[PDB]
Amino acid sequence: KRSVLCRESLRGQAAGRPLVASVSLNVPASVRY
């Protein structure tokens, strides 16, 4: 968990073709937009 206290917040989702694209890879792993 990372503290979200300041002005820094800049997370909201909206890309061109991909939207909420979840990766699962044999090595790495993640969640994007």
Partner: protein
């Protein structure tokens, strides 16, 4: 040097190729199975499918698969969305062949063994837990199940109650119906098309019509609210966007950007973002907000996303609405649309400035359209949007069935009747 090269076969699977200059080649078979293809009885199956990529298959044992790609330093990514499922495959120029034969087993020869599938199961929880760490994912998910009823309302992560219940005939069935020829599109970033085709022809010829899962779209306004203990609250307000690759859509996108607040500057605040300005003025010191814009084949979702603190939730939430109402009242000057546009255009180009980006863009297009639209053309379309057009679209959010999702302490989060 050589530009891409699409080719629809008798099966209906697309395939492209670009012999690039640089050392790294990347194939990626995009099958048309998204989350939207499961039913009440089949939910959570793509998820597991996504996580089960390294299991034994007909020609290669889980051990060889993994150790094999490692051998050569390759990566195998299995990415999905509500609509599609890209199966990426990176490696060195020389090793495509060893790698390709891997991608083909994984995708056309999966062997879900009771014992293997079973040990995976628990992975689903671990994966769900790590992606549910970003409020964005649970809200954004909550949004889709509120706003839809049936198909796209299905989430990407397996429902808690289903986890261990994902059975091997389920996986086998899902592959069989959805991982088929008509729904597939090969894409190479450093391979020969001539040799690509041959392979495609030899290994990708399987039959399976669409919607054995239950395809169809539908939008339904609804609200999903998740109470927490966290200071911060996130909520999404969204109305039926325009559909994928259509004019209306495109318009939305441009509008999106006139309000759209994805910082282009580190530690920098937007001067351009209307939403941010308007919100900001009526809002407290710490807060953040941005225009949300989703587009799928048979429906879309446009609106915004907010991150406010307990007491400020409404103030921000309405503020943002009011401002988007302004554009719907007609109030929008030419100077801002052109900026927007250029913002968009610049973004789409940077989106495709990378191998990974390009490869996605291309496959993506192959499942929608059936061919590759070049950038330029793309660029033209976005420009055609009228300054009015944008307003008009906007008019549609304010006058389109609402659908919201929030998380955190909801004392101060407007309901549907609140706004």
């Amino acid at each position: 040097p050589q530009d891409l090269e699409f080719t629809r076969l008798p099966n209906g699977l697309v395939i492209a190729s670009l012999e690039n200059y640089a050392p790294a080649s990347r194939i990626g078979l995009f099958i048309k199975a998204g989350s939207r293809y499961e039913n009440s009885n089949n939910l959570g199956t793509s998820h597991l499918l996504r996580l089960a990529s390294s299991l034994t298959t007909k020609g290669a044992s889980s051990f060889k698969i993994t150790r094999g790609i490692e051998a050569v330093g390759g990566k195998l990514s299995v990415t999905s969305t509500r609509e599609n499922m890209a199966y990426t495959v990176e490696c060195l120029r020389d090793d495509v062949d060893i790698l390709m034969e891997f991608l083909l087993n994984v995708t056309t020869a999966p062997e879900f063994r009771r014992w293997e599938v079973a040990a995976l199961q628990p992975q689903l929880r671990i994966d769900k837990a790590v992606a549910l760490q970003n409020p964005q994912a649970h809200v954004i998910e909550n949004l889709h199940a509120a706003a839809y009823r049936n198909a796209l309302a299905n989430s990407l992560y397996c429902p808690d109650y289903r986890i261990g219940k994902v059975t091997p005939v389920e996986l086998h069935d899902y592959v069989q119906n959805h991982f088929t020829s008509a729904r597939m599109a090969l894409i190479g970033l450093g391979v020969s098309h001539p040799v690509l085709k041959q392979v495609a022809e030899q290994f990708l010829n399987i039959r399976g019509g669409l919607g054995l899962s239950g395809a169809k779209a539908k939008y339904h306004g609804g609200e999903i609210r998740e109470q927490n203990g966290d200071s911060l609250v996130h909520a999404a307000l969204v109305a039926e966007s325009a559909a994928i690759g259509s004019a209306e859509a495109n318009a939305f996108s441009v509008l999106q950007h006139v309000l759209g607040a994805g910082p282009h500057v580190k530690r920098g605040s937007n001067a351009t973002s209307s939403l941010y300005q308007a919100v900001a003025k009526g809002v407290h010191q710490p807060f953040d907000v941005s225009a949300f814009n989703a587009s799928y084949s048979d429906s879309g979702l446009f609106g915004f996303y907010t991150i406010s603190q307990a007491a400020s939730a409404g103030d921000v939430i309405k503020a943002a609405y009011n401002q988007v109402k302004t554009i719907a009242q007609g109030n929008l000057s030419n100077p801002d649309v052109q900026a927007a546009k250029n913002k968009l255009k610049a973004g789409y180009l940077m989106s495709v400035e990378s191998s990974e980006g390009f490869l996605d863009e291309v496959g993506s297009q192959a499942l929608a359209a059936g061919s590759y639209t070049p950038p330029s053309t793309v660029l033209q379309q976005i420009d055609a949007v009228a300054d009015a057009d944008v307003i008009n679209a906007a008019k549609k959010f304010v006058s389109g069935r609402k659908s919201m999702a929030a998380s955190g302490n909801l004392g101060h989060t407007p309901f549907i009747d609140e706004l």
